[PDB]
Ligand binder design. Structure first.
Ligand SMILES: CC[C@@]1(O)C[C@H](O[C@H]2C[C@H](N(C)C)[C@H](O)[C@H](C)O2)c2c(O)c3c(c(O)c2[C@H]1C(=O)OC)C(=O)c1cccc(OC)c1C3=O
Ligand SMILES: CC[C@@]1(O)C[C@H](O[C@H]2C[C@H](N(C)C)[C@H](O)[C@H](C)O2)c2c(O)c3c(c(O)c2[C@H]1C(=O)OC)C(=O)c1cccc(OC)c1C3=O
Ligand SMILES: Nc1ncnc2c1ncn2[C@@H]1O[C@H](CSCC[C@H](N)C(=O)O)[C@@H](O)[C@H]1O
Ligand SMILES: Nc1ncnc2c1ncn2[C@@H]1O[C@H](CSCC[C@H](N)C(=O)O)[C@@H](O)[C@H]1O
Lengths: 340, 340
C-alpha cells in the first residue's frame, strides 16, 4: 500500500508537469549548457528570484531532469538534455507555455466540463476556438506550424514509403502544413506532382519551405477552405493530422469533399493515429485523443469507428498500417480509403 | 534515446493528473464499487456524456487505475481503489477540484510567474489571496479544514506523545485548526489546559469538535489574529503547519508574537515537514514546498534555514524529534524552540 499510494500521488501531481514546463519556458537547460551552472548565474540569465529558482531546481533534481556535479552547480541528466533547444525532438518548444501547444493545455484545467458536455474547453479560456485564435494571433500560428513540422524532413518518409505511387500522377495534400508530406512524396516518386492546400499564413511558410527544398516546380501551394469544394481533382488525397481536429459530422464533410475530388481509381490516405478498440487502452492513443477533446472537440478514432466514418463518406477502409516515428517514441497510423 | 524521451513526456504531461483529479471529482471509483461497472451506468450516475466518459476511462486504464474484466465492465486496480471516498489516506477528496487544495493547485499553471516574483499565483486566478478567498466562501473554508484534519484522530498522537508535558499548565495552539492537536494533548496529559486560536468559520468547527469530544472545559477556542499580540500566556505554544504559510518576514513576526507570550521556562513547538538541505532534494519536500510558494508565497524551511529564522525572533532550536506518519508515507518533525 505504500507503493500504491505514492503511485497515485505521482500520477495525480500537477506541480511536476508544470515544473518541467517552466524549466522549458525559462530555457534553463540551454542556459546551463552555455556556462551558467549556479543558481545565481541562472537567476541572472532568466531574470528570476534566486531563492525561488533554487526551489524549482530542487524539484528538477528530485525527478531526474538535473543533477548536482559540484557544490551548487547543476547539470542536465540525459533526460534534461532533451530540453536543449537544438535537440531534434524539439521537446523544449513543445513544453513552452508561450508556444501554441503547451498554452493550449491550460484547457485541461476544465476537463470535467469537457467530459460532462463533450465540448472543447479552449475557447472558455482564450476567447476564441482553437483555429480562430491562431488566425487572430499570427505569432501563435507560426509557433503551432513549426511545432507540428519540427520533424518535417523525416516524419513523412515512412508513410510515403508505405504507399505505392505507380498509379499516381497528381497529389492533393488537404491541410498539408508546411508541405512536408507532399515534399517527401515528391522526393520518393519523381513522376508525381502535388498541391498543398492550407490556411492563410501557413501557405506562405509552406511555399518558402518548398522553395528551400528545390521543389517549387513540382509542388504547388493554394490558400483555401477544405469544407468547400476542393480546387483540384487528384489521384491521391492526403489528410495528415486533419480529421482528428473535428467531430464526426465535420470529419465526414471533409472526407466527402475529398471523395468528390477523387480521380477514377483514386485513394485518400489518412495519416494520424488509430487503434483497434481492444488495443486502444494505451498512453499514446489517449494522450492525443484527449488533447483533441479539450482543444477542439475532435477525437482519435478506433479502427472500428473508421469503418463507420469511411462509409458515411462513400468510402471503404482498404488497409491500415502502423508506422514508427523516427524522432519520438510514438506510432502513427496510415489508413488507405477507396471510393465505394 | 527512446526511454529518456518517454520519461520526459510522461513527466511533462498535464492530461494525466487532470484525468486523475476529474475521476476523483466525479466519484468514479465509488460509483463503480456501488455496482455501476459499464460506461453506460457510470455516465448516467455522473451526468457525463457516455462517449467522452469512455475516453476518460480509456486513460484511467492505460495509467493503471482501472481495468476491464467482463466486456465493457471496469473495476478499480490496487491504485484506483485509493480513490474510494472512505479510504484512510482520503486521496479522493485531496484530488477533488471542488475542494480547496486541488482547486488551489490550478495555481501551478502559472508557476513561471511564481519563480520570477517569489509570490503566490492563487489570487491571479481566483480573485483573492488564499485565506481571504476561504473567508468569503464557507464552502471552501470547511473543505480545507476537513482536508487538513482528515487524519484528525491519529495525526497528532505521535507529536503529543513525544513531548514532556509535566511542567506545562497551559498550551496555546496558534492557528490550531479544528483543535485536533490540542485534544490529543489534553487526552495524554489530563492536568493541562489549552487555548486554540483560529479564524472565523474554523472557530465554530473547532468548538463543535471539542464539544463532541467532551473537552469544552479543558480546551477553549478564541477567534483572533496571530499577527496581533496573543490573547494569553502559556508554557508551550504550538505552530503546527502554520509558519510554512508565510514568507520569512511574516513567519518571524509570528514567532516573535509567540516568544512574547511565553512564560519563564516555556518552549514553542513547530510541527512541520523539514529536512537538512543536502537531503531536501526529494519529492516529499518539494511537493509541499512548491504548493506553499504558489498558494501563499510560503515555504518549507530546511534545518539550516530554521536556525536563522529562530535567531531573528530571539530563539534557538534546542531539539528536533523525527515523527513517523501513520496515514500517508510522509515524514514530519517536531522542532522545539527556546529563547536564546
Ligand atoms: C508527444 C506525442 C505527440 O508529439 C504526437 C503527435 O505529434 C507527432 C506528429 C507531428 N506532426 C507531423 C504533426 C510531428 O511529426 C511530431 C514529432 O509527432 C502530436 C500531434 O500530432 C498533435 C498534437 C500533439 O500534441 C502531438 C504530440 C502529443 O500527442 O503529445 C501528447 C497536438 O497537440 C495538436 C493540437 C492541435 C491540433 C493538432 O492537429 C494538427 C495537434 C496534433 O496533430
Ligand atoms: C500528500 C501529502 C500531504 O498530505 C502532506 C501534508 O499533510 C500532512 C499533514 C496534515 N496535518 C497534520 C495537518 C494531515 O495529517 C495530512 C494527512 O498529512 C500536506 C500539508 O500539510 C498541507 C498541504 C498538502 O498538500 C499536504 C500534502 C502534500 O504534500 O500534497 C502534495 C497543502 O496543500 C496545504 C495548502 C495550504 C495550506 C496548508 O497548510 C495550512 C497546507 C498544508 O499544510
Ligand atoms: N477549414 C480549413 N481549411 C484548410 N485547412 C484547415 C482548415 N482548418 C484547419 N486547417 C489546417 O489543417 C492543419 C492541421 S495540422 C497540420 C497537419 C500537417 N498535414 C501535418 O501532418 O503535419 C493546420 O495546419 C490548419 O491550417
Ligand atoms: N492571521 C491569522 N490568524 C490566526 N490563524 C490564521 C491566520 N491566518 C491563517 N491562519 C490559519 O492557520 C491554519 C493553518 S493550517 C494548520 C492547522 C493545524 N495546526 C494543523 O496542523 O492541521 C489555518 O487553519 C488558518 O485558519
Amino acid at each position: 500500500q505504500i507503493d500504491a499510494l505514492r503511485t497515485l500521488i505521482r500520477l495525480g501531481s500537477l506541480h511536476t508537469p508544470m515544473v518541467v514546463r517552466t524549466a522549458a519556458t525559462l530555457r534553463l537547460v540551454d542556459h546551463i549548457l552555455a556556462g551558467a551552472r549556479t543558481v545565481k548565474a541562472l537567476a541572472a540569465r532568466t531574470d528570476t528570484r534566486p531563492e525561488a529558482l533554487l526551489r524549482l531546481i530542487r524539484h528538477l533534481v528530485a525527478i531526474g531532469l538535473l543533477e548536482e556535479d559540484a557544490p551548487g552547480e547543476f547539470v542536465p541528466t540525459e533526460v534534461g538534455e532533451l530540453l536543449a533547444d537544438d535537440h531534434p525532438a524539439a521537446q523544449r518548444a513543445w513544453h513552452d507555455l508561450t508556444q501554441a501547444v503547451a498554452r493550449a493545455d491550460i484547457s485541461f484545467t476544465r476537463l470535467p466540463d469537457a467530459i460532462r458536455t463533450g465540448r472543447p474547453t479552449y475557447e472558455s479560456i482564450y476567447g476564441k476556438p482553437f483555429y480562430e485564435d491562431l488566425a487572430g494571433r499570427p505569432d501563435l500560428r507560426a509557433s503551432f506550424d513549426s511545432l507540428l513540422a519540427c520533424d518535417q524532413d523525416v516524419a513523412f518518409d515512412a508513410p510515403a514509403a508505405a504507399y505505392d505511387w505507380t498509379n499516381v500522377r497528381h497529389v492533393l495534400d488537404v491541410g498539408g502544413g508546411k508541405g512536408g508530406f507532399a515534399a517527401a512524396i515528391a522526393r520518393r516518386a519523381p513522376h508525381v506532382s502535388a498541391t498543398v492546400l492550407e490556411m492563410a499564413g501557413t501557405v506562405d511558410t509552406a511555399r518558402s519551405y518548398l522553395k528551400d527544398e528545390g521543389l517549387s516546380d513540382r509542388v504547388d501551394v493554394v490558400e483555401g477552405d477544405f469544407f468547400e469544394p476542393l480546387p483540384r481533382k487528384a489521384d491521391a488525397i492526403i489528410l495528415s493530422f486533419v480529421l482528428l481536429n473535428w467531430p464526426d459530422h465535420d470529419a465526414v464533410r471533409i472526407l466527402t469533399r475529398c471523395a468528390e475530388a477523387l480521380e477514377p481509381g483514386g485513394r485518400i490516405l489518412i495519416h494520424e493515429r488509430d487503434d483497434l478498440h481492444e488495443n486502444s487502452f494505451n498512453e499514446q492513443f489517449t494522450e492525443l485523443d484527449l488533447r483533441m477533446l479539450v482543444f477542439l472537440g475532435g477525437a482519435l478514432r478506433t479502427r472500428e469507428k473508421w469503418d463507420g466514418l469511411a462509409a458515411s463518406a462513400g468510402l471503404v477502409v482498404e488497409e491500415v498500417r502502423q508506422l514508427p516515428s523516427p524522432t519520438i517514441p510514438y506510432d502513427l497510423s496510415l489508413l488507405v480509403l477507396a471510393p465505394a
